Design a protein around this ligand. Structure first.
Ligand SMILES: Cc1ncc(COP(=O)(O)O)c(C=O)c1O
Ligand SMILES: *Cc1c(COP(=O)(O)O)cnc(C)c1O
Ligand SMILES: [Mg+2]
Ligand SMILES: [Mg+2]
Lengths: 413, 413
């Protein structure tokens, strides 16, 4: 990787550590490229023009395929009109109508940039609404990288999160107890719609857990907040708890509802409308029309096409394939969570040395898979993509067995 | 008009209060349109296709003109390659090199979405760097709408800002005293490069204030942070304190350095590089290429063209024109701050009833000016635009004189 190497030398001079945040390759095998040149459909190309079938989907945003022609057409049409203007475009009204119409629990929407903006807004809203302090979150749940919730706490004060308290995800007793430990002071419960965290097996939400969240919120006046930034529109065409029959008061959305254009949302029921008006949240870029035009067209496609069934079928095929290959090579997998947003670990691999080696070996076959973070399917992944993926993964299992003696854990990890 | 009324009716249903944040027309005279259709150069068109010469410049981002063709071509070129991908584009390196090369105090850059992202990152970085808690800000200075700094505190806890302390802007003794009041506990000083706040006259930064900030930071090891999100690239082609001979440790940038594309930055010296690596900040959209391509082209135009001299000359002409005009009509204006980012109030107008009537009367003449928030000039405003503007302001001054006895203050204000 001549170009990659040049880019990494230069990057370290002018970017702290060469790169930062969730897309940094600091904790990945060294074979993983940091910098890319182009993307299309379900593929990315690194700086040295090596293609990869992309199972990160840009860490969520690529729902329908990179440079999907209908969304790029809608964005083009709005770009001729205006983007970041002295006021929002009229199409802000159309977007809020569309999004509110699709989400059964919601009567209103607010638009922002980052998913962290929507979760932070939900936190402040809930405190305004209830006049209480305590925000309940699941231990280890990722809701953004603000001082109140960032998972690494360099430069974070105890005071930044003194009124955040924790429960065990999928543990109805734990959540009940959390309500009583801060009796009378719960502003909100935040829940992701399933367990989707790094270095950990995924798990679907348990019905009893979700019901208890809704019932405790009901009995106390606390707001139920579903954080759908990650799973939104890959579980359902509505809030990801729709199939449990549990409606939140607020839901947070982002990543993929404009297929890569930067826009996030807070959706809320009429119960929370007054508090939403009382709080002050804004940003320079929150009223920009082009991301809103992309979102309108993405949401239309979500409503009008079998995008969801398509990307689930691709996910299921990959999962079945990997199960068969794992048995054949005698290397047991743990494929957890929904097949369309899979976590694919090795059984009995506590320092991840097997998973790391397998993921790196998949790069050589032109497949990008991730050894510690959940993956994603797009509606642009084809049957041929899955077939070619499985040829790469087959070779990767062989390469891991061939080298098995010499496998090492990642130093930094 | 008719379209505007329909949109406001529809907006109220699906958006809390029908709109929110800085771009809400809540506190403006009712003639101000909320929703727009298009923008080009120095003009915006509301939903009823009425054009205005725009002196808000989208509340800062429109530095070079809406849909500036060279920036749009650079954005097009990148859009054919890739935008939001599994990793950043190689052009992130080019951007960082360019921005670092232009900013004398800076050795590295980090990119995010919101200006609030950059200011929050600088806060967390300073705490990590120093191991101290206290952040010093000027009373009433706007640094974003995060829980630690948001100007309206519905849903905000005392604990959200218990380690933020305040000084009086442009009062060196006040700042020096705030250092001593938290002796050995100052992580950072934040300062905007001039006073630019709503409902208040603007004021340029005093040299002795800026030197005291630098010297107290030098003596204590606190980081000096200049918040250049609003003023950046309308004062200078570097950090807005360049002409005072004062270099900060960190500077925050946003709004206009990609001419409307959503991107913000934190620029830092090597002193702060280790802390920058230690903290965890990220966002789904922070590594998107197309705003970075727009930023590279905007920065080139900033370096290679007389854009700054152009918008300063336009601002200077408008200011001299309005001074002469107001005097002829027997009304005194208070035109404060740089001519290129002016606050234009009336003398002896404590409840803004005069300023509000005047601003409203300007709208009728195809001029968008703001009675409580600073305005902005773009390099796309021409001498003829200013000439046409002064014809409309003439009729506005006459309308104010005519209706003078019947002026009433804004209800909600
Ligand atoms: C569940 C969840 N919440 C919040 C966020 C924050 O979104 P962003 O990175 O756009 O701030 C992410 C990513 C996420 O996966
Ligand atoms: C607008 C502004 C910010 C915040 O930027 P957003 O993009 O709105 O989050 C920060 N500092 C100053 C001086 C500003 O004017
Ligand atoms: Mg609804
Ligand atoms: Mg420099």
């Amino acid at each position: 990787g001549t170009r990659q190497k040049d880019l990494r030398e230069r990057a370290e001079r002018v970017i702290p550590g060469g790169m930062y945040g969730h897309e940094s390759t600091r904790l990945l095998p060294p074979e993983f490229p940091q910098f890319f040149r182009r993307a299309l459909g379900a593929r990315i190309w690194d700086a040295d023009e090596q293609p990869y079938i992309d199972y990160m989907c840009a860490y969520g945003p690529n729902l329908l395929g990179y440079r999907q022609s209908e969304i790029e057409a809608a964005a083009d049409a709005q770009r001729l009109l205006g983007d970041t203007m002295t006021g929002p475009s009229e199409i802000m009204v159309n977007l809020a109508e569309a999004f509110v119409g699709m989400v059964r629990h919601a009567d209103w929407a607010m638009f922002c940039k980052n998913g962290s903006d929507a979760t932070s807004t939900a936190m402040v809203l809930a405190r305004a609404h209830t006049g209480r302090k305590t925000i309940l979150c699941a231990k280890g749940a990722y809701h953004g990288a603000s001082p109140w919730n960032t998972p690494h706490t360099a430069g974070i004060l105890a005071s930044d999160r003194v009124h955040v308290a924790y429960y065990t995800y999928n543990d109805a007793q734990s959540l009940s107890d959390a309500f009583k430990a801060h009796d009378g002071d719960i502003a909100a419960v935040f829940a992701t719609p399933f367990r989707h965290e790094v270095f950990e097996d995924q798990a679907l939400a348990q019905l009893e857990f979700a019901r208890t969240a809704r019932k405790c919120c009901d009995e106390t006046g606390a707001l139920l907040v579903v954080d759908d930034v990650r799973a939104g529109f890959r579980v359902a065409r509505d809030c990801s708890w729709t199939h449990l029959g549990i409606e939140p008061d607020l839901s947070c959305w982002g990543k993929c509802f404009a297929n890569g254009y930067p826009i996030s949302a807070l959706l809320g029921s009429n119960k929370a409308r007054d508090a939403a008006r009382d709080i002050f949240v804004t940003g320079s870029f929150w009223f920009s029309a082009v991301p809103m035009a992309a979102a309108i067209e993405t949401l239309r496609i979500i409503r009008e096409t079998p995008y969801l069934e398509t990307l689930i079928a691709s996910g299921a095929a990959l999962r079945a394939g990997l199960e068969a290959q794992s048995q054949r090579h005698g290397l047991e997998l743990k494929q957890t969570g929904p097949a369309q947003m899979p976590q694919i670990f090795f059984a009995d691999d506590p320092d991840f040395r097997i998973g790391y080696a397998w993921a790196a070996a998949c790069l050589k076959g032109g497949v990008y898979v991730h050894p510690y973070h959940n993956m994603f399917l797009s509606a642009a992944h084809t049957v041929d993509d899955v077939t070619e993926t499985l040829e790469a993964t087959d070779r990767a299992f062989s390469a891991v067995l061939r080298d098995f003696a010499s496998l090492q854990p990642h130093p930094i990890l």
